Design a protein around this ligand. Structure first.
Ligand SMILES: N=C1NC(=O)/C(=C/c2ccc(-c3ccc(C(=O)O)cc3)o2)S1
Lengths: 296, 258
């Protein structure tokens, strides 16, 4: 730990703070995630334990790279490759101008490649929001923050319900579903795609019921035809208002016929019908795909 | 049932080989024996039943312990500390609600301190280099169950029962990979309950013929027949209960005809 000089606190992650640091000997700029520890209590947090072991399995250009684990008695540091900023800051900085469609297409293509790699190595991310997606100066975007992530089984068991930042949380979690899997990460990515297109969060609810209703008002209220089994779900209420489906030309105006086809497959109600990250990579929306550099 | 099943199967088949313990590590342990490990594993079964822990958590902790004892000499009076920290780590990894350190200390009846349990947690993470996402017989069995035409609960409970019996005995079961033990366990469970055999669709998925499962399957048939005589009995007791369809009460087949 004495080879690193700290440059600046660059945030608070899902748990513990992230610093910019440099290696005093090689010059390498790194991100340090400091995790606080206890004897007198619980040990290494289950959240750090998951993050580090899953990250060891997840070496991919579109997944943040773990360089080292500095495991003391008193402190635990994770050493990461350094990335310039997160997608939430990028989105705010370009809120008036907009993100160019070739770069939205690029970024989504890459997030889906990272995600396909995760899913096909039995990992659920469970926290895809723009602040957990990092970008560099060269046109690359990467999944980060595997603190809430989980290694899953085939078929799945019941996992933690307390899952995904509200605005990016899939309807099957909201409705109290017993099982959920990889389709919840695709939901969040659908939400982010739309957020990039329109510059505002697609479904900015402020409680679980408000989140559901915002979903219902946009996509229509789901029924047995559209989603076999819905009306039989734990937190489903047959008194839910029945809204009609909003037309995507209105929902996400800037997007062409291919982009709207893909988004509606990422926001499918039925988790089993919802497009997979591998299938999504094969969608006509990506035929033209380039690797533009962010115009910051 | 998705689009990732084969990818995951193929990856777990690579990982099981990278995550295996050294087969002969016990011959190089100067203070501990197989029968001591068998007493430890049987106890972890009880700990799991006491805390309502997943079977997966049990399989993981046994993997952590066997890989840890692959590179580390442990005296007999420190063995339960290895096992406790391993079950603590497995719970942290796999459980929705892992039990607390203080609860782990209570189940050792104050044999170790909290400081010790947590210092050992740090050493197991060091020795395992944080590589905790290991394949288990469990993970393979659940995939294999999707091939039962149609779903039989007693078969699944007996397969689970047999895969768990294999944890207790490092001689012979350290010789075999999780996917092989699971094939054998599934075949034997199927054969016992219904008379059917290792299915063609699984021969194709796994690359394993019934012949190739023969060595592990001869062993496991023996372990099954002698189960009611065995020194360790926590698995049989657990599998008598009605959530397991009382499958440890079923009579093994006297003959396999293989
Ligand atoms: N919550 C996290 N989980 C990780 O793995 C992280 C790794 C990481 C590497 C680089 C950064 C990073 C994050 C934010 C910023 C900015 O807001 O400018 C700049 C860099 O995070 S952050």
């Amino acid at each position: 730990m004495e080879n690193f000089q700290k440059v600046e606190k660059i945030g608070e992650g899902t748990y513990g703070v992230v610093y910019k640091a440099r290696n005093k000997l090689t010059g390498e700029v790194v991100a340090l995630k400091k995790i606080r520890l206890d004897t007198e209590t619980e040990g290494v947090p289950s959240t750090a334990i998951r993050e580090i072991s899953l990250l060891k399995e997840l070496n991919h250009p579109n997944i943040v790279k773990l360089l080292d684990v500095i495991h003391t008695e008193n402190k635990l540091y994770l050493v990461f490759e350094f990335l310039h900023q997160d997608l939430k800051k990028f989105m705010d900085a370009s809120a008036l101008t907009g993100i160019p469609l070739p770069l939205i297409k690029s970024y989504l293509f890459q997030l889906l490649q990272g995600l396909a790699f995760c899913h096909s190595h039995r990992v659920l991310h469970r926290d895809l929001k723009p602040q957990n997606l990092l970008i560099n100066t060269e046109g690359a975007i990467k999944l980060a923050d595997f603190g809430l992530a989980r290694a899953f089984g085939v078929p799945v068991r019941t996992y933690t319900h307390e899952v995904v930042t509200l605005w990016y949380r899939a309807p099957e979690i909201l409705l109290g579903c017993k099982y959920y899997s990889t389709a919840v990460d695709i939901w969040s990515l659908g939400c982010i795609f739309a957020e990039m297109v329109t510059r505002r969060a697609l479904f900015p609810g402020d409680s679980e019921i408000d989140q559901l209703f915002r979903i219902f008002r946009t996509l229509g209220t789901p029924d047995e035809v559209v989603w076999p089994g819905v009306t039989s779900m734990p937190d489903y209420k047959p008194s839910f208002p029945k809204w009609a489906r909003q037309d995507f030309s209105k929902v996400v105006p800037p997007l062409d016929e291919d982009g709207r086809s893909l988004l509606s497959q990422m926001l499918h109600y039925d988790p089993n019908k919802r497009i997979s990250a591998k299938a999504a990579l094969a969608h006509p929306f990506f035929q033209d795909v380039t690797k533009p550099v962010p115009h910051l | 049932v998705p689009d990732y099943h084969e990818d995951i199967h193929t990856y777990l088949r690579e990982m099981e080989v990278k995550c295996k313990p050294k087969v002969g590590y016990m011959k190089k342990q100067p203070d501990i024996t197989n029968s001591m490990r068998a007493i430890l594993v049987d106890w972890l079964v009880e700990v799991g039943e006491e805390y309502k822990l997943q079977n997966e958590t049990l399989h993981l902790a046994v993997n952590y312990i066997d890989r840890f004892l692959s590179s580390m000499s442990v005296l007999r009076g420190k063995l339960q500390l290895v096992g406790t920290a391993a079950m603590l780590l497995a719970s942290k990894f796999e459980e929705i609600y892992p039990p607390e350190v203080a609860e782990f200390v209570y189940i050792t009846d104050d044999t170790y301190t909290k400081k010790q349990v947590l210092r050992m947690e740090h050493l197991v993470l060091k020795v395992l280099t944080f590589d905790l996402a290991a394949p288990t017989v469990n993970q393979f069995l659940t995939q294999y169950f999707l091939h039962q035409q149609p779903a039989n609960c007693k078969v699944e409970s007996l397969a689970m029962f047999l895969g768990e019996l294999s944890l207790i005995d490092a001689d012979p079961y350290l010789k075999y990979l999780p996917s092989v033990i699971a094939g054998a366990a599934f075949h034997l469970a199927l054969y016992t309950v219904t008379g059917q055999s290792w299915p063609e669709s699984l021969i194709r998925k796994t690359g394993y013929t019934l012949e190739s499962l023969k060595p592990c399957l001869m062993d496991l048939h023996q372990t099954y027949l002698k189960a009611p005589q065995h020194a360790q009995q926590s698995i049989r007791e657990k599998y008598k209960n009605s959530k397991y369809h009382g499958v440890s009460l079923l009579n093994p087949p006297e003959t396999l005809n293989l």
